Amino acid sequence: LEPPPSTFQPLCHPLVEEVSKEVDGYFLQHWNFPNEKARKKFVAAGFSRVTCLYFPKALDDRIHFACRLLTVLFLIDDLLEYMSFEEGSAYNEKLIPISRGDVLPDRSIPVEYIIYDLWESMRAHDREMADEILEPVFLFMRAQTDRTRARPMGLGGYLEYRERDVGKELLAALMRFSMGLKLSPSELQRVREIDANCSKHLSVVNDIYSYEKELYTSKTAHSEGGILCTSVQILAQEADVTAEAAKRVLFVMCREWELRHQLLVARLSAEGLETPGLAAYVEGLEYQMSGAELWAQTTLRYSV
Amino acid sequence: LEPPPSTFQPLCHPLVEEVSKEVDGYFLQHWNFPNEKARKKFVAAGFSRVTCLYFPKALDDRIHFACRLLTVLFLIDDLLEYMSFEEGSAYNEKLIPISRGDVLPDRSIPVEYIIYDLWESMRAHDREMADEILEPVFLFMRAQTDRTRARPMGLGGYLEYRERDVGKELLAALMRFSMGLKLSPSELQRVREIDANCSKHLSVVNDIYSYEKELYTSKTAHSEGGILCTSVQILAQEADVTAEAAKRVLFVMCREWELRHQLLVARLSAEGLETPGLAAYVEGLEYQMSGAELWAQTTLRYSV
Ligand SMILES: C=C(C)[C@H]1CC[N@@H+]2CCC[C@H](C)[C@@]2(C)C1
Ligand SMILES: C=C(C)[C@H]1CC[N@@H+]2CCC[C@H](C)[C@@]2(C)C1
Ligand SMILES: [Mg+2]
Numbered sequence: 001l002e003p004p005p006s007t008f009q010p011l012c013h014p015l016v017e018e019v020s021k022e023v024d025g026y027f028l029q030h031w032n033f034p035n036e037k038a039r040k041k042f043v044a045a046g047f048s049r050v051t052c053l054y055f056p057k058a059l060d061d062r063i064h065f066a067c068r069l070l071t072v073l074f075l076i077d078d079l080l081e082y083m084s085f086e087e088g089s090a091y092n093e094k095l096i097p098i099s100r101g102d103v104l105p106d107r108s109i110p111v112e113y114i115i116y117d118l119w120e121s122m123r124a125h126d127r128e129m130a131d132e133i134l135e136p137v138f139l140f141m142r143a144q145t146d147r148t149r150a151r152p153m154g155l156g157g158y159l160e161y162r163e164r165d166v167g168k169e170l171l172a173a174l175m176r177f178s179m180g181l182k183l184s185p186s187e188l189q190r191v192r193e194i195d196a197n198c199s200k201h202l203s204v205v206n207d208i209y210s211y212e213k214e215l216y217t218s219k220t221a222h223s224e225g226g227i228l229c230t231s232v233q234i235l236a237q238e239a240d241v242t243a244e245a246a247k248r249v250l251f252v253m254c255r256e257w258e259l260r261h262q263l264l265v266a267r268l269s270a271e272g273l274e275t276p277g278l279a280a281y282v283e284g285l286e287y288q289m290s291g292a293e294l295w296a297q298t299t300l301r302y303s304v
Numbered sequence: 305l306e307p308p309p310s311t312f313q314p315l316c317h318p319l320v321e322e323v324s325k326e327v328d329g330y331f332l333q334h335w336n337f338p339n340e341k342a343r344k345k346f347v348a349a350g351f352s353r354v355t356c357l358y359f360p361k362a363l364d365d366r367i368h369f370a371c372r373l374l375t376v377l378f379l380i381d382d383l384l385e386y387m388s389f390e391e392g393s394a395y396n397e398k399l400i401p402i403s404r405g406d407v408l409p410d411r412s413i414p415v416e417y418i419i420y421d422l423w424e425s426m427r428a429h430d431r432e433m434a435d436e437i438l439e440p441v442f443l444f445m446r447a448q449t450d451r452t453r454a455r456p457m458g459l460g461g462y463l464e465y466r467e468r469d470v471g472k473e474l475l476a477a478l479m480r481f482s483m484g485l486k487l488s489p490s491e492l493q494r495v496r497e498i499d500a501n502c503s504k505h506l507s508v509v510n511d512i513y514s515y516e517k518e519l520y521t522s523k524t525a526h527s528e529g530g531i532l533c534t535s536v537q538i539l540a541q542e543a544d545v546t547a548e549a550a551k552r553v554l555f556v557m558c559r560e561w562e563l564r565h566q567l568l569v570a571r572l573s574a575e576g577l578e579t580p581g582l583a584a585y586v587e588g589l590e591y592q593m594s595g596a597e598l599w600a601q602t603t604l605r606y607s608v
């Protein structure tokens with residue numbers, strides 16, 4: 001599968017080696033892997049490597065929080081494949097008060113106390129921005145078990161939904177957190193179009209490289225939790241072509257959203273609307289788009 | 305614009321120039337054109353030229369019949385853009401019993417006696433093969449003013465509907481009629497999948513090249529009869545990109561259908577399933593696709 005040209009240049013955080021070994025070790029110490037094989041697979045996926053690709057301009061003392069959050073959010077995304085919607089919702093909902101720091105963790109259950117301890121250290125470092133990540137996270141978590149996954153969706157319907165299930169807002173607030181990027185409500189409203197456009201790129205690039213994994217998941221895991229929900233499948237059905245054909249067509253569209261991103265950014269500069277904070281923000285969203293693509297191409301998580 | 309490569313080579317019927325003067329000459333004589341600017345525009349469209357690219361291996365004494373049918377269907381296609389869905393339906397339904405020979409034409413209304421004399425002459429040359437073109441035509445006629453045009457559609461449902469509105473079935477029967485190509489029912493049953501795939505290519509390729517023309521029509525003619533119903537519109541909506549962007553993506557989807565055409569034709573031959581009659585037919589379809597594209601990218605009908 002050959003990717004079409006992109007003008008984007010992915011960047012990686014300079015401390016990716018240290019921070020990855022640090023956060024990897026942590027999870028190998030506290031998390032519950034079924035066997036040595038699953039432990040090996042976990043390190044292979046490179047969950048801190050991708051976090052360092054999403055947020056290459058992260059503050060050095062802050063990047064490790066993001067790796068931690070995204071790692072466990074990744075570990076859970078996989079576990080939900082083997083539950084029903086009910087089971088999966090119950091699972092997520094228990095973690096939400098713990099995340100607010102409202103209910104203590106059952107310290108026998110790794111996921112409970114890992115999440116509790118994460119959010120506490122985050123609020124300790126920067127309470128205000130830490131707190132602005134909470135609702136975007138929950139929004140994502142409740143999307144993961146939304147019954148709309150079991151209803152037929154067209155392309156537009158799907159992207160509307162995937163904006164939550166792919167975690168666009170949570171990634172945005174985590175980005176802002178990890179950089180210390182403070183934006184007024186004015187500025188944040190000002191770029192809703194750029195967000196929406198960027199969300200489609202993140203969704204579809206991921207749909208393209210993870211399709212094979214997800215096809216096998218839809219055959220072997222839970223009939224609800226492992227349900228096949230992807231633009232690849234939708235487009236394949238609608239255009240009556242193979243998934244491989246659909247991938248190639250969706251990749252060209254992703255490049256159109258990149259171009260559209262440059263256009264919107266340029267236009268926002270063509271008024272005084274591009275504040276310095278906003279400028280660093282939309283540069284940030286470009287790192288996410290390109291970074292996620294670089295990782296998706298090279299991670300063992302998707303070529304297996 | 306910049307079409308990506310195609311494996312298909314177009315062919316033009318050798319008599320294209322004679323039949324063009326002849327058929328153009330007939331319609332310039334009988335059709336009620338409003339003025340001289342429109343008679344010139346009709347000749348610049350080159351309708352006999354596109355017919356001779358659709359069916360480049362049509363029998364020499366049969367190709368003119370096809371130029372006639374398509375020429376009158378092109379003219380009526382433009383008419384219905386000035387009509388409501390009701391007016392257009394009323395107009396086409398008049399013509400349906402006249403085509404069958406069940407009703408005599410009003411010899412003072414050109415469209416009626418042109419239609420009547422066309423079908424009677426075609427039944428004279430090959431009764432049973434002419435017969436089989438009728439219902440596919442009425443099917444495309446009725447599609448043209450179906451209110452589903454004005455309702456929301458996703459890409460999939462659009463292609464389903466456009467299979468009728470692009471007249472894929474009438475084109476098939478016509479191609480057979482033009483070539484003396486008789487196929488058994490079970491033969492036709494074997495290429496149904498190949499037919500459907502070919503439909504999408506014809507539709508979307510036409511949609512790409514005729515978009516600026518249809519845009520303008522939607523804005524100037526009747527709000528119903530000239531409504532913008534096109535894959536370029538639908539993809540641009542679902543994916544939130546410009547029309548030019550959608551065209552670039554749809555073009556890639558069209559090459560994927562050429563690939564699928566080839567794959568389906570190879571599969572058919574690898575069983576003992578490609579009869580000699582079927583062999584001509586699917587080669588026939590491939591001329592329709594590459595021919596439609598050649599005309600579309602040069603006709604003044606879509607460029608001015
Ligand atoms: C940014 C992406 C393409 C998503 C890849 C998959 N993971 C699942 C775990 C949580 C993340 C937000 C994400 C949805 C990111
Ligand atoms: C085969 C096509 C892409 C269509 C081009 C436009 N014309 C309009 C008049 C009727 C024809 C069947 C057609 C729809 C063919
Ligand atoms: Mg998921």
Ligand SMILES: [Mg+2]
Pocket residue numbers: 077078
């Ligand atoms: Mg998943």
Ligand SMILES: [Mg+2]
Pocket residue numbers: 206207210211214
């Ligand atoms: Mg995926």
Ligand SMILES: [Mg+2]
Pocket residue numbers: 381448469
């Ligand atoms: Mg039409």
Ligand SMILES: [Mg+2]
Pocket residue numbers: 381382
């Ligand atoms: Mg038309």
Ligand SMILES: [Mg+2]
Pocket residue numbers: 510511514515518
């Ligand atoms: Mg058109």
